Amino acid sequence: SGAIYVGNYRVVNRHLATHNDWANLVWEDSSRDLLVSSTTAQGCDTIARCDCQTGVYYCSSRRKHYPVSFSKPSLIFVEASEYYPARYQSHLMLAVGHSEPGDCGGILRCQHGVVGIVSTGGNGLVGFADVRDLLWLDEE
């Protein structure tokens, strides 16, 4: 589990969105595994606007933050899970790092701010849904 709280937005994995998220929906995209809902309180996270390929992510199944090198956002075939059949996921970045299904939502961050959230993984890989191209998260 986990979310990004920026401005009056809450960014979560679409497959973990709650009824309150769907009832306060701003934007969702199944191919990216992302959903954004509106919040009453202002959040403290800031989004990175960069092309970093090194950062740190939080892994709840280890209660630890790990440094990682990650790929650029791309269209990758992701195996079937409890939440989606096997399909192509867009804006996804891969790294070598531990992950389990419930690690989805952990933040990946670089020197500039939040880069994305854990979305996929297995066998010593972890994939992150990028949010750096969603410029509208910084306004309204």
Ligand X SMILES: CSc1ccccc1CC(=O)N1CC(O)C1
Q: How far apart are CA 119 and CA 104, in angstroms?
A: 5
DSSP designation for 23: H
Please report whether residue 48 would count as binding Zn ion according to CB under 5 A: yes
Cα torsion 40, 9, 55, 58 to 10°: value is 50
Nearer to ligand X, 77 or 135 (CB): 77
Q: How far apart are CA 127 and CA 93, in angstroms?
A: 5
CB of 128 to ligand X, least distance (A): 9
Both tokens assigned to 41: 């309180």
Residue 75: contacted member of ligand X, Zn ion, none (CB under 5 to 8 Å, by partner type): none
Chain residues in the site for ligand X (CB under 6 A): 13, 15, 33, 78, 81, 83-84, 99-101, 103-104, 118-122
Query: Are the C-beta atoms of 91 and 77 separated by less than 8 Å?
Result: no
Active site residue 104: yes
Active site residue 44: no
Residues labelled as active-site residues = 15, 33, 104
Binding residues for Zn(2+): 50, 52, 110, 112
